[PDB]
Symmetry: C2
């Protein structure tokens, strides 16, 4: 896990304004979530061939589909896997008013076929420490909400929650983590999309997109679900189903 067969290329432009285009297939856990009608509404991350992790505030149901292997949402030409959802597991601690504990698991009906362009992100241990100032990467088609239809990426640093409160105040809870405000926007991440950091040669899922600056400010950090705080619940859910 965490080692793409097609390696990401990250340039200085990933650090400013709205990031830059990714190399196709270089973020192989990134999936798109489409509703009954084919409309892309959220992101998510494969954690193995049968399970996708996304945000609870996406409100995914079993009439939505998981789309793997995608790069260009405007191309009907690329090999993709449209996978049906058999069951949705929303974290019971999710507070839909503060958006705290913002995580949901999706169990697929049939397994994805892992390949060079479809494979799993690594999950952290609950005890892992990702320090403030660490450069991490967020990816998604979140800029289409306002414009390129190809997968974008940005490099942005983690913040301590204390420093994140200077921007967002009391909305920041312990199961949250912030990144950005470094002169680059966080809006390329879809709701539910990944924030990953490279630990010992492998990319690890550190955050899930919860919300960001209402104006895509380059000086306002994104707020993510903190995966260390929720990974025990993830592993308990996989073991019981």
């Amino acid at each position: 896990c965490g080692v793409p067969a097609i390696q990401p290329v990250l340039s200085g432009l990933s650090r400013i304004v709205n990031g830059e285009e990714a190399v196709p297939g270089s973020w192989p856990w990134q999936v798109s979530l489409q509703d009954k009608t084919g409309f892309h509404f959220c992101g998510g991350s494969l954690i193995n061939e049968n399970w996708v992790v996304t945000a609870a505030h996406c409100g995914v149901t079993t009439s939505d589909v998981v789309v793997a292997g995608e790069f260009d949402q405007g191309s009907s030409s690329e090999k993709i896997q449209k996978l049906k959802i058999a069951k949705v597991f929303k974290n019971s601690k999710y507070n839909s008013l503060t958006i705290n504990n913002d995580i949901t698991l999706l169990k697929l009906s049939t397994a994805a076929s892992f390949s060079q362009t479809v494979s799993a992100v690594c999950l952290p241990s609950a005890s892992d420490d990702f320090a403030a100032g660490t450069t991490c990467v967020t990816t998604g088609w979140g800029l289409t909400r306002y414009t390129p239809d190809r997968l974008q990426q940005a490099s942005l640093p983690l913040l301590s929650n204390t420093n994140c409160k200077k921007y967002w105040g009391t909305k920041i809870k312990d199961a949250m983590i912030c990144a950005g405000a470094s002169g680059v926007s966080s809006c390329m991440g879809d709701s539910g999309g990944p924030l990953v950091c490279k630990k010992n040669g492998a990319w690890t899922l550190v955050g899930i997109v919860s919300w960001g600056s209402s104006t895509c400010s380059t000086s306002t950090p994104g707020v993510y679900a903190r995966v260390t705080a929720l990974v025990n619940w993830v592993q308990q859910t996989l073991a019981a189903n």
Copy 2:
């Protein structure tokens, strides 16, 4: 319904900055929603002795309590009714990502005792037309989220959805309505709290608080669930339960 036994007094100060204090008991349908621990997290409105209407994004469950007859949340001295919730009816069309169709009904276990300070707001017909520019009133303890602990009120005008889109863009859906940006803030309304307008001597529930300006701007309108679009669902739910 819609005719308080204690009549509201609304002065010019209800029109600017953060509104003004209400006369005690003059908004008798206003309830407070408290969790297991007594913490006030949302508002709502009585529509009869057995049913409270609030917003779906409040995520109310049967371990929360409805508190009626309140004025001063810091006073342990006033007569109030703490009412248990027997069942929660979230509108199935609620989209937790756009906050569209943001309405939930609460059926009480035991009826409230209606009085001078506890009584019901009127519901509109689906076909009622509340025109842009109509002065309406929002009430709540929403300023405690940042400060007075007594019930506040503000007068603010309705906007057409077209004009509301100039502020909020594509987040405005048909089951929504906006009010304010007239030099007064909308933040005194709790999530799920009422927006009422006086039609033929009776106060009618026109909106339910969905979200507002992240900085409580006096030039940014509040966004509410549009009750005309959801009242048929309300009446269908009351008739089947």
